[PDB]
Amino acid sequence: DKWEMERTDITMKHKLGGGQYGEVYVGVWKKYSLTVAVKTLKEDTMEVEEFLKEAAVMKEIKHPNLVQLLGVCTLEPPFYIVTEYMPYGNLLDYLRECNREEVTAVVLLYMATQISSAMEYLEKKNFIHRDLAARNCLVGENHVVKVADFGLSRLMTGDTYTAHAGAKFPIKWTAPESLAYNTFSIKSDVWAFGVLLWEIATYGMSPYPGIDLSQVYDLLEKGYRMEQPEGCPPKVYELMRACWKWSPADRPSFAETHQAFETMFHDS
């Protein structure tokens, strides 16, 4: 198809983000003097069909707050997926390092809004993300934020995705039903989005500090939730709490979350 590109066009450099994203690399598409990100299929995956399914979804996504697919190499091994490279790194590190007189509460709201626009678009396309978190959001020029879009899955709304037994999740971002039953949905992404919103509100602190991973389900089941961070507006906390409702059906849609953020700008 039109996405196939020449692998020898790419100069492969180091693993991206010091290896925290697995077999994703920084490369240069030499012709265009362009730095790109390159996900490869290495020893990790005896799962070639899965990698191809991932790429398939990416070919159907175009949004200003989702990482842009540039091409693929799947005419021979090893298979590649090639996206734009975001030069300022991930949102977690960015919040932790930033000057808070520049990254003000106004900018935090802009960040949150852009992420909720991305997720509204995925929701509408019946795609699930499964790893929404500050570490998987990327920063560009002028506080542009883009959500990473490797690892997405098709799943119609009203349907649920069941991860294989022994699949390992980022516990503190994972909805209780996903913890308990390996069951994922757009509403488990909404839950993760509330946790991301707390990461944004705290300038990238670690969630549920001092709580062991073994205790997180029991904490949530008994009705406890992370407290409102100092200076977090009540309306933003209410939204967080809506995302962490026990029943997935009671959690807002991303359409609703995005709207809430738009309204907050006018209410300001």
Ligand SMILES: Nc1nc(Nc2ccc(S(N)(=O)=O)cc2)nn1C(=S)Nc1c(F)cccc1F
């Ligand atoms: N498109 C894109 N650009 C970047 N840039 C980046 C990320 C981290 C860093 S750092 N400061 O070296 O960790 C520097 C640049 N990351 N990146 C995305 S898609 N990374 C990413 C992700 F955020 C989640 C899963 C897989 C991934 F490859």
